[model samples]
Target: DDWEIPDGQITVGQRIGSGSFGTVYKGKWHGDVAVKMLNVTAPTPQQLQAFKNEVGVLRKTRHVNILLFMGYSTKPQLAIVTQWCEGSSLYHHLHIIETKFEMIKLIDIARQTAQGMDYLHAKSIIHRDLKSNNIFLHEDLTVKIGDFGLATVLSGSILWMAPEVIRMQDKNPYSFQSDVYAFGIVLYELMTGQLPYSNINNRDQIIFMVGRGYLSPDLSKVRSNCPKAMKRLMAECLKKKRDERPLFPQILASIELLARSLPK
Candidate 1:
């Protein structure tokens, strides 16, 4: 296929990070890249199918705020190579490094992420595992949504999960609205620099509240300087009725309005 890469060309180096799929290495293909080598050399039939699907999804997807998929290699080991993000994951920037974002810059982050997600949804792709950790950043602070089209390993994602997704039993339980729900959680994190539901002590209790639509994130925790429109957008995104949540087009328009109203 067009997306195949030879194992001989890849120079795998130090461990960059790890994911649900496998360990990530800082490697050289044509240039510096993040090489995710699947934990298993001999994948199950199901795993191979997932890898095939992800390759197709990444190859077809192209957006400024989406990770660039260089190619994949099955020889030597199962590896998916992508553009290495110099700035690291959004989770690292927000929680680990404890960095702060100005309101305008935060707004730009929102716009760029929504812009990328919009492209995915328009093509009928669903990022069922959208979260701060999965969202990468460039050195210039550009958002790059990654980790698409793979079966989710949900240990850390439950907090950002949509109500319907939490309660559903179907194989394909997520929709675009589910992604928007996660987006709302991410927006809350951007506004307050806090993890969603971090104040909650009981994971089971939080899951019950989320699945039952008994609660959303504590909006009161948002920064005092945050804009009303941004807050409103977050609330809208967290709506329990999946149909009520705004699509990416509406989301982008709202963000555009918010951006335009900013005083120079």
Candidate 2:
């Protein structure tokens, strides 16, 4: 079952996007306010719980680099209304711009992402899927993290998962270190325009490599132009030992300093 806005209660405008669980439509309330209607079918208990968890997480947090939640509806079907972000997904813009952004701009994105992740980690939340596709960037270069569909109050994803998390086999306890690991992958993607495992054809190969401590990203292969400082940050983030990685705020601060040193 899906929720339907009363004929005149909300005016459906245009389709904005789609994801695994639902399609998002742009709508208007009172002819002035823009809203998003997430059309979802009957959800499983786990899925519904995830929806509730996301709503709770969004309600308690606010950050300049994180998406804003306006409200939601679960009864007549599911719809989550959030502040409409007027920007392109980072995935789309990376390839279009001719001159590579000065390292500062890239670092700005990294810093904002780290700040957002730090806040979420402080609140004991984990964003399972952190990638360029999920990061939205405004024309002014302000970045906002979005898409919590795969997020979990506990733990999430094997690929982006930290070594400790995989070793412990504790899927119920969320950890900030795992987020750091994922951020490493995201950073790698931002610099290279490709995912760490983008070349692998078999899933089993990835699992095997991850199991054997080959999880750290190979920075040398990605971008020849990346600065030394940024490359070091990526290496630290991808450290297999959770204890070896720097905390989110530390990474954020270091990147900010490095960013300032780069030419405009």
Candidate 3:
């Protein structure tokens, strides 16, 4: 509950966000640096494990498109310090803008995101939750993946999980391929501004649909302004079969091609 900041050490600036597990606050460290503190109550074993795994994975990742974890605290209370991003999440921007995102801008975001995911996959780490809200965008429109709160060292969640992950449900081995599934959902959200599985209220129903070869997301409702290649790429990413989905490297290539095809 208590963040346990040392007296006069640092002053909390403002509350940035809150979620089921924790609250994030903006703070100044040593007068010159801006940082985010993710404060949590007595974390569950699963939450602590996730936090520790995120720290370890972040330490190994040096990608520009991934949020940097500065440090963490467990004594007295639990907290994680991360580099501050000035801009709000991509989720907010997508909603505020009356016009749909430009094809080039979407491609840029996708390419950067894929690059970060590629780095994680190279190290056999899979980000469990990859969504628009977790992606922070700068004034320059560069993107960085954030919110590693749900991240897991083991190839993560089903529901939105890949078929291989479903097969290995017993072993539950971590794989980059699983991240690709999350990526597909993210790509769908970016283009349509709608959550995947939005129609199905029940989790079991969604799972049944996914299991019965109904994993293809409905992009028909997307604004006709969306580019053809982008639509095709998103469709390809959401393919039910894990092997049929694009690897992060292939995704990066497709994103590049999509970018090039856009008018200057």
Best candidate, TM-score: 1
Q: TM per model? A: 0.94, 0.80, 0.80
Across residues 125-172, which tens digit of lDDT does each residue of candidate 3 receive?
677667676778865477878876666653334545665555455665
Clashing pairs in 1: none
Provide the overall lDDT of each model, using Cα atoms, as 2-decimal numbers.
Answer: 0.84, 0.69, 0.68
Give the distance in Å from residue 201's predicted Cα in candidate 1 to where it truly belongs.
1.5
What residue runs in model 2 are displaced by over 4 Å at the alpha carbon?
1-10, 30-43, 95-100, 152-159, 163-168
Please list the residue runs of candidate 3 whose C-alpha ends up more than 4 Å from where it truly belongs after superposition. Answer: 1-8, 19-21, 30-47, 95-99, 152-168, 199-204
Provide backbone clash counts, one per model.
0, 0, 1
- By lDDT rank, best first, the candidates go 1, 2, 3
Q: In terms of lDDT, which candidate is stronger, 2 or 3?
A: 2
What does each candidate score in C-alpha RMSD?
2.1, 4.5, 4.6
| Candidate 3 residue-wise lDDT at 116 | 86
Model 1 ranges off by over 4 Å: 149-156, 169-171
Per-residue lDDT of model 1, residues 27-123, tens digit only: 9988999888774759887667777777778888888888999999999888889998888787888899988888888888888989988888888
Candidate 2 residues 158-199, lDDT tens each? Answer: 656666656665754345777888888778867876656767
